[PDB]
Amino acid sequence: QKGPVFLKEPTNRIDFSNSTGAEIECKASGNPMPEIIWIRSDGTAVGDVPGLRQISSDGKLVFPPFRAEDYRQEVHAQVYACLARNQFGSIISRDVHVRAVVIQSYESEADNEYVIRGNSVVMKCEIPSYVADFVFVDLWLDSEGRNYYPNNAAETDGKYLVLPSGELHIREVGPEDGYKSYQCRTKHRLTGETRLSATKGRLVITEPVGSKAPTFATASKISSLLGSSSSDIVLLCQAQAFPVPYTRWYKFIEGTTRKQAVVLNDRVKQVSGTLIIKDAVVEDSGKYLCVVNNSVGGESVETVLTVTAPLSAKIDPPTQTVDFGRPAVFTCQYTGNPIKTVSWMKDGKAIGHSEPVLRIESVKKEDKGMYQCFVRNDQESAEASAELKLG
Amino acid sequence: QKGPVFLKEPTNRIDFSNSTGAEIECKASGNPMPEIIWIRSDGTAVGDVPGLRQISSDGKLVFPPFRAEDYRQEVHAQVYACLARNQFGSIISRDVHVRAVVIQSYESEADNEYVIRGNSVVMKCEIPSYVADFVFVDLWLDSEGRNYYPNNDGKYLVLPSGELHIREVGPEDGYKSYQCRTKHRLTGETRLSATKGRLVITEPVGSKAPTFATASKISSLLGSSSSDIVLLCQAQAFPVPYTRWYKFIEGTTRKQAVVLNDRVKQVSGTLIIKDAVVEDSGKYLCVVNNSVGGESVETVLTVTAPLSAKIDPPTQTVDFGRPAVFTCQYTGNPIKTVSWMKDGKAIGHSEPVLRIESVKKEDKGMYQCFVRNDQESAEASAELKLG
Ligand SMILES: *[C@@H]1O[C@H](CO)[C@@H](O[C@@H]2O[C@H](CO)[C@@H](O[C@@H]3O[C@H](CO[C@H]4O[C@H](CO)[C@@H](O)[C@H](O)[C@@H]4O)[C@@H](O)[C@H](O)[C@@H]3O)[C@H](O)[C@H]2NC(C)=O)[C@H](O)[C@H]1NC(C)=O
Ligand SMILES: *[C@@H]1O[C@H](CO)[C@@H](O[C@@H]2O[C@H](CO)[C@@H](O)[C@H](O)[C@H]2NC(C)=O)[C@H](O)[C@H]1NC(C)=O
Numbered sequence: 059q060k061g062p063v064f065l066k067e068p069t070n071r072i073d074f075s076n077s078t079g080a081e082i083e084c085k086a087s088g089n090p091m092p093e094i095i096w097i098r099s100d101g102t103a104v105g106d107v108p109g110l111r112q113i114s115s116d117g118k119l120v121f122p123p124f125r126a127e128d129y130r131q132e133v134h135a136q137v138y139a140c141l142a143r144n145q146f147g148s149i150i151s152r153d154v155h156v157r158a159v160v161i162q163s164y165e166s167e168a169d170n171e172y173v174i175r176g177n178s179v180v181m182k183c184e185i186p187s188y189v190a191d192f193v194f195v196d197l198w199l200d201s202e203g204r205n206y207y208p209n210n211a212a213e214t215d216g217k218y219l220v221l222p223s224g225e226l227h228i229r230e231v232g233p234e235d236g237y238k239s240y241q242c243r244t245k246h247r248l249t250g251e252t253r254l255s256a257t258k259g260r261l262v263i264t265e266p267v268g269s270k271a272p273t274f275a276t277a278s279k280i281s282s283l284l285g286s287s288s289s290d291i292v293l294l295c296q297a298q299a300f301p302v303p304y305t306r307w308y309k310f311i312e313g314t315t316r317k318q319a320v321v322l323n324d325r326v327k328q329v330s331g332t333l334i335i336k337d338a339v340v341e342d343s344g345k346y347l348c349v350v351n352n353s354v355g356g357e358s359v360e361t362v363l364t365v366t367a368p369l370s371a372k373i374d375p376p377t378q379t380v381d382f383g384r385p386a387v388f389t390c391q392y393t394g395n396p397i398k399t400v401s402w403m404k405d406g407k408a409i410g411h412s413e414p415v416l417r418i419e420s421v422k423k424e425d426k427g428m429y430q431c432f433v434r435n436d437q438e439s440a441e442a443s444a445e446l447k448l449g
Numbered sequence: 450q451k452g453p454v455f456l457k458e459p460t461n462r463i464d465f466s467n468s469t470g471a472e473i474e475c476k477a478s479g480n481p482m483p484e485i486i487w488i489r490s491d492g493t494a495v496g497d498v499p500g501l502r503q504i505s506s507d508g509k510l511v512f513p514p515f516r517a518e519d520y521r522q523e524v525h526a527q528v529y530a531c532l533a534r535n536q537f538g539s540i541i542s543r544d545v546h547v548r549a550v551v552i553q554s555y556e557s558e559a560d561n562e563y564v565i566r567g568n569s570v571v572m573k574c575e576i577p578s579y580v581a582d583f584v585f586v587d588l589w590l591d592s593e594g595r596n597y598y599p600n601n602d603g604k605y606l607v608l609p610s611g612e613l614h615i616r617e618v619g620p621e622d623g624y625k626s627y628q629c630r631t632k633h634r635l636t637g638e639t640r641l642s643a644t645k646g647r648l649v650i651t652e653p654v655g656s657k658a659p660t661f662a663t664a665s666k667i668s669s670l671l672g673s674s675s676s677d678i679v680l681l682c683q684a685q686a687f688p689v690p691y692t693r694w695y696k697f698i699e700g701t702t703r704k705q706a707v708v709l710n711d712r713v714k715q716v717s718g719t720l721i722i723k724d725a726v727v728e729d730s731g732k733y734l735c736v737v738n739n740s741v742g743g744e745s746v747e748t749v750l751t752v753t754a755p756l757s758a759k760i761d762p763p764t765q766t767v768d769f770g771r772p773a774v775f776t777c778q779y780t781g782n783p784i785k786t787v788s789w790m791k792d793g794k795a796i797g798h799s800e801p802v803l804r805i806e807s808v809k810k811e812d813k814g815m816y817q818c819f820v821r822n823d824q825e826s827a828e829a830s831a832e833l834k835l836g
């Protein structure tokens with residue numbers, strides 16, 4: 059009757075630990091019911107590797123736990139896929155990127171941050187490059203025993219705020235905050251075990267010796283950051299000075315030298331120089347300018363934001379019947395941000411086109427089969443299925 | 450008989466401590482002996498605040514040393530200027546910005562850096578942002594007593610920006626401890642790192658895709674023309690990756706790799722430029738790659754040549770209604786905005802070439818060309834006589 063249609067596909071990124079292991083599933087339907095075949099991204103089938111990779115009873119790729127010594131790259135750190143197939147044609151899933159990571163002991167360095175009294179500060183949990191993806195801050199803790207818990211910012215009103223980007227924001231530091239010391243404890247999203255910071259950060263408060271220029275923590279006059287759609291994103295202004303200055307956030311109008319001021323809502327909030335875009339959307343993207351002036355002068359810093367949305371695609375029509383000699387067109391409709399490549403596939407084999415509209419002019423008995431459009435950006439991809447028929 | 454021009458033009462930026470003190474001197478030229486007046490940037494004149502600001506004889510301005518408590522902003526941190534006058538009119542001295550520093554007893558933290566063996570790492574001893582305008586790192590030291598040095602053997606290297614670079618990080622390197630010595634440029638007072646940097650060497654096991662220190666895909670940087678400039682690439686991968694630095698073309702997606710030679714060198718992921726030119730200014734790209742993966746980061750760069758200029762002709766005479774023109778020959782990088790002023794009065798034109806084909810009776814006097822940018826400046830003048 060019909061061709062294979064993908065129901066449950068795995069996720070673009072599958073990460074796990076050598077102690078846990080993983081078993082991933084792929085589901086397709088149609089008449090006759092297709093059989094699920096596991097393959098690499100280049101379309102080559104994968105066999106067992108006893109102790110590492112084994113295909114189980116029903117259509118399920120398994121990665122049992124393993125010694126750190128038994129780690130094998132081509133098995134664990136790999137690009138995978140899922141192939142559903144029957145009489146009509148074949149289809150491939152979105153590329154499934156597996157990275158299995160052995161448990162590797164890590165430590166968090168809470169950095170002492172220099173400040174002038176009256177200025178607000180943000181102190182950071184320094185985390186190594188390699189665990190940064192798998193680890194984040196569970197909470198903040200001081201020497202006095204007060205836990206500062208991380209939160210979506212509904213209420214930005216308070217002395218202490220733990221913001222979603224993982225830092226601890228303190229409004230207008232003073233002597234009372236001077237002899238307090240702070241720990242950050244982090245959680246591994248695979249293991250789920252918590253670890254306190256080894257070194258404790260402390261606020262070092264200088265006094266308004268002079269009156270000076272605004273000074274950012276770095277010489278960088280431009281930055282960039284990325285955030286998801288539903289996430290609460292945090293831009294930063296780390297500017298420091300005396301006398302304590304005021305912050306103004308602006309957003310650039312695209313492709314021109316003309317700026318515009320950021321409108322604050324119960325959605326968009328400001329704390330010190332910290333801008334909070336909480337409950338974001340793609341249109342929040344653009345070039346931003348933080349501007350801090352004081353009595354002695356002023357300086358400014360650019361920031362490039364890009365909001366990403368989940369890639370999804372649907373082919374119109376899911377199926378169509380045509381007669382020999384008549385044109386048959388397929389149109390791939392997509393969402394998510396950003397987009398780089400849209401590409402077409404036939405029965406598992408590629409067709410060079412960058413266009414969302416696939417147009418065959420005169421059908422052939424050759425052209426009968428299954429069609430797919432592949433939408434992709436660096437960190438993500440998606441798969442929509444389609445069938446062709448003849449008369 | 451004739452009008453003024455600037456012979457002695459004090460430095461654009463002046464810094465000094467409370468213990469040292471400082472002084473400035475400004476002459477020009479011309480006839481009769483020009484009135485040398487010191488003015489704050491907006492043309493209001495400035496008098497004495499004795500003990501700090503007072504005008505010494507010769508019409509020169511001195512800043513005597515002072516205690517910390519007596520400090521007041523308007524005199525110390527401020528932008529001053531200078532002006533000369535005859536019947537020929539006035540001319541303004543360029544941007545002078547002045548600062549003074551009370552001793553904060555600066556502290557410097559040596560930051561622990563966590564690394565997978567085989568990967569080259571950069572160590573930064575972090576100086577606070579406010580004092581960083583002066584203090585720099587002269588030397589680095591470890592537990593063994595090893596003295597490193599600026600270097601403007603090929604393993605351990607300190608850069609012109611002051612950080613310490615290590616390549617092929619081994620187990621021999623990590624279980625040491627590191628600390629840096631910082632010297633202040635307005636005093637000469639040195640000091641040793643408060644804390645001691647520990648290098649944690651982690652055992653590579655599972656293969657890791659290249660990751661950077663921060664999520665930011667871009668950075669900006671700049672330096673003087675004659676300076677040796679560094680471009681950081683901080684990347685850690687297992688397998689240890691290979692860093693290839695490209696360079697873009699202005700406002701285009703076009704790309705080319707770069708020319709490794711005597712002036713433009715490379716160490717690990719670090720692209721180093723020796724004594725440079727404004728022609729090196731541009732937008733670069735750092736791509737890191739290994740078997741598992743790897744990604745890219747781009748770095749903006751600028752080079753700054755000194756601002757200077759003059760007007761052609763330096764002087765001329767004209768027939769009352771006959772054309773008179775002045776063009777500003779400019780150099781230095783970047784060049785933001787040229788500005789014209791009549792006897793210090795601000796009269797706008799954005800063109801390097803300004804002309805008057807119709808002369809009034811009152812246009813007799815001095816004229817200037819101000820070449821300006823964010824923090825920097827230069828000035829030169831010309832004058833038209835009516836005959
Ligand atoms: C996945 O790979 C991991 C290594 O990358 C494996 O974990 C390691 O396993 C070895 C021995 O199998 C442990 O060494 C033992 O340590 C215990 C004491 O406990 C340890 O406690 C923590 C670990 O969380 C830490 O403080 C120290 O490493 C302690 O050693 C001793 O009693 C033993 O005699 C032996 O020395 C490693 O400690 C451990 N590393 C970890 C957990 O980070 C893990 O077993 C692998 N999984 C599978 C399924 O093979
Ligand atoms: C705050 O400081 C910024 C610079 O850090 C000022 O922005 C511009 O600065 C350039 C060069 O310094 C000038 O050419 C522009 O004219 C400035 N902008 C404007 C709109 O004039 C900014 O003006 C300062 N704002 C305040 C209130 O001090």
Ligand SMILES: *[C@@H]1O[C@H](CO)[C@@H](O[C@@H]2O[C@H](CO)[C@@H](O)[C@H](O)[C@H]2NC(C)=O)[C@H](O)[C@H]1NC(C)=O
Nearest residue numbers: 436734735736737738739740742743744745746
């Ligand atoms: C070097 O790393 C890049 C980053 O993944 C590899 O991939 C290309 O990266 C460029 C950006 O510099 C993109 O424009 C291309 O689309 C990427 N192509 C692919 C196939 O990923 C690149 O292949 C690496 N170079 C090698 C392996 O020689």
Ligand SMILES: *[C@@H]1O[C@H](CO)[C@@H](O)[C@H](O)[C@H]1NC(C)=O
Nearest residue numbers: 467468514515516517551552
């Ligand atoms: C400059 O200020 C510091 C601040 O403590 C002080 O110790 C020093 O004596 C001052 N210098 C003079 C010359 O008074």
Ligand SMILES: [Zn+2]
Nearest residue numbers: 153437438439
């Ligand atoms: Zn992919």
Ligand SMILES: [Zn+2]
Nearest residue numbers: 169170558575
């Ligand atoms: Zn630090």
Ligand SMILES: [Zn+2]
Nearest residue numbers: 064067441442
């Ligand atoms: Zn799909």
Ligand SMILES: [Zn+2]
Nearest residue numbers: 544824825826
């Ligand atoms: Zn200036």
Ligand SMILES: [Zn+2]
Nearest residue numbers: 167184560561
């Ligand atoms: Zn650190």
Ligand SMILES: [Zn+2]
Nearest residue numbers: 455458828829
């Ligand atoms: Zn001059």
